[PDB]
Amino acid sequence: MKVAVLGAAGGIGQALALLLKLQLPAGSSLSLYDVAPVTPGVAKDLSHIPTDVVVEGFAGTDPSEALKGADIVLISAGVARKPGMTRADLFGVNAGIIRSLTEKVAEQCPKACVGIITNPVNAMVAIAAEVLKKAGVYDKRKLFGITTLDILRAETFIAELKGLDPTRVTIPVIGGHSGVTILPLLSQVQNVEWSSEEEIIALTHRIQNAGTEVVEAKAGGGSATLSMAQAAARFALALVKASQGAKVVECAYVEGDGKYARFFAQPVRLGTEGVEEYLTLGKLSAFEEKALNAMLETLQGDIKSGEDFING
Amino acid sequence: MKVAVLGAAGGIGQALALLLKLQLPAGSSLSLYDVAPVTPGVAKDLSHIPTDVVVEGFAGTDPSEALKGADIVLISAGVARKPGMTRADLFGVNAGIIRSLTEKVAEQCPKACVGIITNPVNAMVAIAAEVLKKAGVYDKRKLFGITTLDILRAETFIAELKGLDPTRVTIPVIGGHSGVTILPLLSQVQNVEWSSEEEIIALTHRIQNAGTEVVEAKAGGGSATLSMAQAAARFALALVKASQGAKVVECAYVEGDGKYARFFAQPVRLGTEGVEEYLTLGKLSAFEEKALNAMLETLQGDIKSGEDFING
Ligand SMILES: NC(=O)c1ccc[n+]([C@@H]2O[C@H](COP(=O)([O-])OP(=O)(O)OC[C@H]3O[C@@H](n4cnc5c(N)ncnc54)[C@H](O)[C@@H]3O)[C@@H](O)[C@H]2O)c1
Ligand SMILES: NC(=O)c1ccc[n+]([C@@H]2O[C@H](COP(=O)([O-])OP(=O)(O)OC[C@H]3O[C@@H](n4cnc5c(N)ncnc54)[C@H](O)[C@@H]3O)[C@@H](O)[C@H]2O)c1
């Protein structure tokens, strides 16, 4: 098992690299790549931790050496939202970074699973799909938008509100990865009596807007880095577990059956070659059915913006 | 169990806070304090992780709120060595930070265990001891210089050189926490046939100088942050395990029997009230006995420099 992290010198990159150095299976390797000159030193820092995980670090213009033989590629490269900045600002900075790095994946490790962290995920994942298609290597089973932070948030907020164990709250989160496209299926949550519709609506809002609590409370210091690194590590370790032949189930933004949108976040069962089965959303409340049809235009617009960058 | 991290917004601080948010026992709390205005946002970032660990964050001039009810206080506050900077540069920047923060420990949580990360540890721990003594609350069983990074390095370098499992290499490291004061007892290492004296000397050197490999390879980007956060978390979790009534054994820089120096890094058994027993160094090789007597002057000089800052 070899995992490559592209953007490994950043806030998310460094914490993610630490969690993977601590938690990847003994016998694994970890390669870090970032345009930041510090990157070989980040790898040197991690190499002092006593786990049987070979860690190498690369800066420079060419991630080919980090990517050679990679099974899993995690991309946290690009700028984070600071106060004042819009989705549109992020797209303009990050689209070309995602285009550049996914071209190099197609060249060096086209059979790898690819996990996109870089925002806006909804559009960045469609960019990577179109680059892989232009290279003739696109396997839709192997490309993921990492939405796992929306799951961490949902688990935490449910457990804190309802006095539950946050380690054992399960909650599917479907749709997309931004504002109104995030749909947590609170109707399916166990061991909770909802006060009323009010409580469900307010919890849904808090899950959808949680990034702003952080962006705000850091006050220009940046966005969520440490929670996102945990979310990415959790997803990555799920893919490693699936590579060993485990049944693994995770919410991720994937090119599925296209019932609602070309890309849609849903529970998937992972096998040894990416997605093995696309799982049901299960039973939606009236509230969930309406929220689903209400955000579909935004989600399809996010996808189009990524497709149109690569293809017109 | 409540753990306070002073310096929680820095390179070490943030990664340490993440590992404690992930690993402290369910029912724990974690309070973060730093002079950096971002600190409440670091805590907000971590609060989105689904563990039963209450995380709060404080900036401003007064750590009293973070420290109220603390059982364990970890101090990573102060500047790290960049290229050009000497031990003397660090002492001048960090002495007053350690004096200030330990006065606040004496006021708000005098019965807490205190773990000093801030360098130079050899002198910073004697400063904290003299501040606690001036406040009339010093318990020498409860004050530690965290040397655990020297243990991580020793474990890793032995396992990489000798083809061993780095998760199961045990190596006592004694003396102090800088250059020639670091003494790894390589004579006691199992499952290894030393090529010759040469190999033991070169491995000892690499353990003593490992910080420079990182400071160098980051090239001004800073020193070891991610490995040090793991080392601090390991030590902290050892103290939490001891609080539950476990026999726990760790190398730490402590005011022991003073056979070699007032403060000396040695294996200690932890109980529920800090150090319960000061353990033997065991059998020293000729090489280890000579290296021990050869660095003692430097170590005693490091301690004096801390004592003399507080007392003349
Ligand atoms: N999916 C999610 O839930 C989620 C949540 C939080 C943030 N994010 C996103 O993650 C990204 C990283 O955020 P951060 O806070 O770590 O940012 P950061 O600025 O700290 O780190 C980004 C890193 O990307 C590197 N980078 C830039 N161009 C590169 C290239 N061509 N190749 C390799 N590395 C390159 C930079 O040098 C930097 O080290 C941002 O886009 C942010 O929006 C996603
Ligand atoms: N013991 C070891 O093995 C070991 C190894 C590596 C580094 N270190 C030391 O750890 C320290 C931290 O290193 P780093 O790389 O995280 O540095 P950093 O500069 O990234 O972080 C230091 C933090 O301390 C904060 N701080 C400063 N004064 C403060 C005060 N009065 N109260 C609270 N917070 C305060 C700063 O605002 C900053 O957030 C340095 O002294 C470094 O030498 C120790």
Numbering used by the authors:
A (entry chain A), B (entry chain A): 1 to 312
In the authors' words:
The key enzymes involved in SA production were identified to be phosphoenolpyruvate (PEP) carboxykinase (PCKA) that converts PEP to oxaloacetate (OAA) while producing ATP, malate dehydrogenase (MDH) that reduces OAA to malate using NADH as a cofactor, fumarase (FUMC) that converts malate to fumarate, and fumarate reductase (FRD) that reduces fumarate to SA using menaquinol as a cofactor. Among these key enzymes, the NAD+/NADH-dependent MDH was predicted to be important for further engineering as it converts OAA to malate, which is a committed step toward SA biosynthesis. The crystal structures of MsMDH and CgMDH were determined and detailed structural comparison was carried out.
On the other hand, CgMDH activity was reduced only to a small degree due to relatively mild substrate inhibition as reflected by its high ki values over the entire pH range. It is notable that substrate inhibition of MsMDH tends to be alleviated with increasing pH, showing a pattern similar to its pH-dependent activity. These results suggested that the replacement of Gly11 in MsMDH with Gln (e.g., Gln20 of CgMDH) endowed MsMDH with high overall catalytic performance observed with CgMDH. The MsMDHG11Q variant developed based on structural analyses exhibited significantly increased kcat and higher ki values compared with its wild type.
